[PDB]
Amino acid sequence: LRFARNWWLTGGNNYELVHEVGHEREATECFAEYAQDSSRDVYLMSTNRLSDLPPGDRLKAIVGLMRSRWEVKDANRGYDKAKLLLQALECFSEMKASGQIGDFNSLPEPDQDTFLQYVEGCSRFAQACSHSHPDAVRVLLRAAQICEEMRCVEKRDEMIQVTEAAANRMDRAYAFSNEDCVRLKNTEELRRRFGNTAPKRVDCLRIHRNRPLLLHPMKDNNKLLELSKLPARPEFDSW
Amino acid sequence: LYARKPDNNLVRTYSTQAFVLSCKAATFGMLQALMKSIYEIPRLEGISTEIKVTEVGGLRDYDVALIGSSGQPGCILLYGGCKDTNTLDVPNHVTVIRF
Amino acid sequence: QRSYVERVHQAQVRFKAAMELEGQREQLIEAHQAMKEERMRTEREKRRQLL
Amino acid sequence: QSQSSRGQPGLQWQEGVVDPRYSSSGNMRRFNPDTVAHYVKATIQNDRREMGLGEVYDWHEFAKDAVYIPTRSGPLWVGSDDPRCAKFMRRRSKMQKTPQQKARPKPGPDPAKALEDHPLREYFTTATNLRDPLSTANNLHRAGLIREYDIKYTAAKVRYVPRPPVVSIMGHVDHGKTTLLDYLRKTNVASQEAGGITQNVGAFQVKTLGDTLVTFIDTPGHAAFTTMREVGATANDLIVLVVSAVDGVQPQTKEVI
Amino acid sequence: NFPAHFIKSAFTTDPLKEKQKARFSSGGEAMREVQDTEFQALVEFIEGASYDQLISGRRFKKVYDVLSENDDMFIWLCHTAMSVLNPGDMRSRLIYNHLRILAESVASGEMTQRTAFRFFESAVRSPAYREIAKRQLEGGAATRLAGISAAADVMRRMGLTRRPMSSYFELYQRIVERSEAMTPWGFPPLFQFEERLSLEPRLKFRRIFWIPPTWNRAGRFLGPHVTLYPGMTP
Amino acid sequence: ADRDDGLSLQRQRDMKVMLGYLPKGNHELYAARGDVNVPAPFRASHPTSVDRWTHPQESNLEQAARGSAVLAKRLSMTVSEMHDRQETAENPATLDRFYYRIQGPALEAGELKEALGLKGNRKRLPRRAPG
RNA sequence: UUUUAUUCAUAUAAUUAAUAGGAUAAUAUUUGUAGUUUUUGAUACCAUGAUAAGGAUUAUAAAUUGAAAGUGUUAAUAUCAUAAUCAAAAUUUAUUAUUUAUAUUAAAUAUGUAUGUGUAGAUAAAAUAAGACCCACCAAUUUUUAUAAUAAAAAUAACGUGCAGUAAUUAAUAUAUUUAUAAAAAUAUAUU
Ligand SMILES: Nc1nc2c(ncn2[C@@H]2O[C@H](COP(=O)(O)OP(=O)(O)O)[C@@H](O)[C@H]2O)c(=O)[nH]1
């Protein structure tokens, strides 16, 4: 019906047809078949320490670390966040120091605002954690040095003022260094009742549709309780 | 980058008496002491004890199910006077040691 | 080849990081134990003197 | 090619004894030259002669390489050089040469670092440091008796009060720890104890000396209860080691010391 | 195993080779370097009798198809069925006009011969036609000859023939076949015509080899021209 | 065991069947048979499968050759021939049209058709991404 | 109650890698050109091609001396493109179509044993320049109903027995009866 048991092709008839056509548009367009090419396929190596990566890749890893910290969402003490932000700023600082074209004056608006928000977040975290960690002002000073390296006087002066004020604040701080009532009333009433004087749970079984069934104790008058109390084998067991 | 591939053609063939053992103590310290003593007990030549369930409660239904269902000889140890709540009946081939 | 070398190098780096973390934990444990021993020695000599 | 009975088998252990077919002495999948009948050997040799194969010389040594094949007829014993088990023998040899031939998933990020980055890390609680008011205030906040802004303020507010002492009675077996506690409490427990042996830790508060509360923990002296001894050692602040006068220092006393 | 021959002409040409091929060979260079169907089939067939050609069965089959491709068989069937009718009866006039329309449609090709034969068999198996034909046969003097002669003449006039005067030779053949008394006049074999038309959509009424044997294929063989026992030609 | 009658025909055939000389499924065998150029499933009843059958996939390096073949044919053709035959840049032009008759074993005939390019089945095609 | 014939004879032994010109030519001692040593399928295996056997049918009548042999497959075999341990010189080793009664060994060593009235069975040859898929038990696990000392069904790739449909080896089927370690049939009707 569908498959042939005979596996030999006989001679005669069996004139198959071959038809070939071609369009110039196919040859001109050539469509596209670039799935994976040598240009887009490259080796990949991994380094544990973040100083091995170049400053750009160091920042590309620092942003992921910041995302992980945000996923943690603990907030509260932010010394680790301050260190991450300081490393992020050090990426720009070493970019400028090494000799890259990146200079704060030459930076475009997006990169300028990114630098500003990074240094602002670092300074905010350092100011928050200055009292908890005595060395947070060190990261504040390092951020101010990074701003000076980038040659941004506007943020540099603010960083210097905030770090001086943080040092002063740290120095000064270190130099300084119904339900219950209802339950109580009920307990008192119960204790008074007990002093003056000087119910039982019933097992429940969820049978069907999670409907409870209560097995209440059998009435004391029926014969079944005495039937259970009587010995099983009179000849063998003691009476 | 490859792990060992199991082969199901090999099967276990019993050479010794396989004693399936369940242990249940009255208290957690009793359970720890019983486990330590059991593991300090050396293995005999023709005896192999397999410890399935160790607990702090009394005899349950799942204990009887684990020990008596398989034809292998079974021992259930009850350290202390823990109250039992098993509704089934323990098979005769299974030794219950209440101590 | 690229996939094999990537996987192997990542595994090596991760194993090194884990071993370094365990070494740091062991050093922390040893320092805490040393502090405990120092405190215990002071307490023992104080106990003898007070007795 | 596969050594497994086609019909679905049941329990291989009878209620009291092991099934002979599944025992080592009567393994159904092992060719036993000491118990096989004449017709089995006749069939094996007939196959080895009908198809080009070596002559069967020693049944005891041939049983080593005898390959078992399940059939509706029963066990089929096929020589290691017989073509029927060629794929099975090839796979077995490849397994013997190199068994680890199945790929496994790449391990992910280290769970230890994942714990550092866990979203619920701040909910972890720790035993209060008995000498740290900051730790006491932090535990108070974590229990929800003070707000998070009251940590440093309540740290100074924390004060220390003398608590009743806890003393653990330890020693060797039959050295009189139970009898000493029994005399102290006037309860007669050493006689009503089952077997005359202590196997459960008991904490009892007594009003002795200057009408002060002292909590005694009766640690058993049997060698097995090392965990109970450790629990008593951790809980108690003072330990009383009772040694018999007639019976000298024992290994249990040595380990307690 | 089997080397790739790539007999396709589109799998053996590439733009790199075509770029150099086009310069040497193109339309301009090629131009610079180079310098009644029945009758045509008949002359093609008979030109094989030249001194440099042979009579081939392909050409004879071609000319036979060209000669027999018409539907004059069906047209003559319809008009022979019409001949027996009575030019005075109104039912006979209706049947005559229906069959004339059928024949005209067949000649024009507007209706396929299969459905035309369905119409024809349904028309000729009707009781009215059978009764009319029975009266025609019973009459001592009948109009069958005049009817069939007029049928040939109208087949010529209306252009229902491959050639203008073929209808008269077909009429002569019809009369000489009527001399054989194969079937009563006006009662064609419908089962026979149905069997014909089920298979054929159109109703109709020293060896030479294209592949010579090779030495590997044939062990001891010389050829179709060699004579092992020749004679002496004067 | 030299001068032995040997295994019976039925026993030998059953042994070969057990060993697996008979394929478990017919899909691979009828795909390589070469009588038809259809893909492995041998049955297309979905619109995408039908489109796959109607428009066989071809690599760009060979589509360029196919278009160059018609470019060369039109270049060889004269202006008047092209205009009369309606062979223009937009109208498609046929390249090859022939009939062949093949006789012999199915598997070997299929392999021969693969070698000659008559059987486009069982062809590996590199993957493509997006457009 | 159509013709013809048939006794047929050698058969194992051992070692296999490179180019280099001359008389009558305006000159080359290059007359006489000097760098050991890291690889391995057939002294015995290549499975694939040919061959054997071997068939087809239109030519009316007149003229003309004319206008007239063609192969699949099944088979066996083998020296070829494909899978390492061994045949070609020292030949006994038995391998189809032969000279029968007048004269019988001179140039490479060239046949001493079968006369028996030409008396079997088998075998070969030709009309040609001649003149005719698949059943039951057994084995093997096991599963359900049942716990009665039950009993029964069913799932199952390699066993051992008997032979069971597919126009199929036998008119078919059904009912009833009978035998054999319990397969297969037999017997007797009814139906088609
Ligand atoms: N004479 C005497 N007997 C003692 C003393 N302490 C314990 N015993 C004996 O030890 C027995 C109880 O042992 P127990 O205290 O329970 O052993 P332990 O729990 O291991 O210390 C009693 O029968 C006493 O007779 C003691 O101080 N004097």
Ligand SMILES: [Mg+2]
């Ligand atoms: Mg005690």
